[PDB]
Design a protein around this ligand. Structure first.
Ligand SMILES: Cc1ccccc1CNC(=O)N1CCC[C@H](C(N)=O)C1
Ligand SMILES: [Zn+2]
Length: 139
């Protein structure tokens, strides 16, 4: 679990969105596993606007932060799950690092701010949904 709170927006994994997220829907994209809802309170987070390929992520299944080198956002095949059929997930970045399904929502950050959130993984890999291209989150 986990979310990004920037301005009057809450960014969550689309597969973990609540009934309240859907009732306050701003934008969603199944191919990216992202959903953004509106908030009444002002958020605590800053979004990175950069091309960093290193950063640090929070891993809830270890209660620890880990440094990672990750690939640029790209189109990657993801096997069928209970949430989605087998498909290509877009804007996904992979890195070597521990992850389990409940780690989805953990933030990846570089020195410029929030880069993305955990969305997939397994076998010593962790995959992050990028948010750096969503320039509208800042206004
Ligand atoms: C092993 C692991 C580690 C971290 C996260 C997930 C997993 C394994 N489940 C998994 O990949 N999916 C279920 C949740 C939604 C995911 C998606 N983006 O399509 C697909
Ligand atoms: Zn950066």
């Amino acid at each position: 679990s986990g979310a990004i709170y920037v301005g009057n927006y809450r960014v969550v994994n689309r597969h973990l969105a609540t009934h309240n997220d859907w009732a306050n829907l701003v934008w969603e994209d199944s191919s990216r596993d992202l959903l953004v809802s509106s908030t009444t309170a002002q958020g605590c987070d800053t979004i990175a606007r950069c091309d960093c390929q290193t950063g640090v992520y929070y891993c809830s299944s270890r209660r620890k932060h880990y440094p990672v080198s990750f690939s640029k956002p790209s189109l990657i095949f993801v096997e069928a799950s209970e949430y989605y059929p087998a498909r290509y997930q877009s804007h996904l970045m992979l890195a070597v690092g521990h992850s389990e399904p409940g780690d989805c929502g953990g933030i990846l950050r570089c020195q410029h701010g929030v880069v993305g959130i955990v969305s997939t993984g397994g076998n010593g890999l962790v995959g992050f949904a990028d948010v750096r291209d969503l320039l509208w989150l800042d206004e």
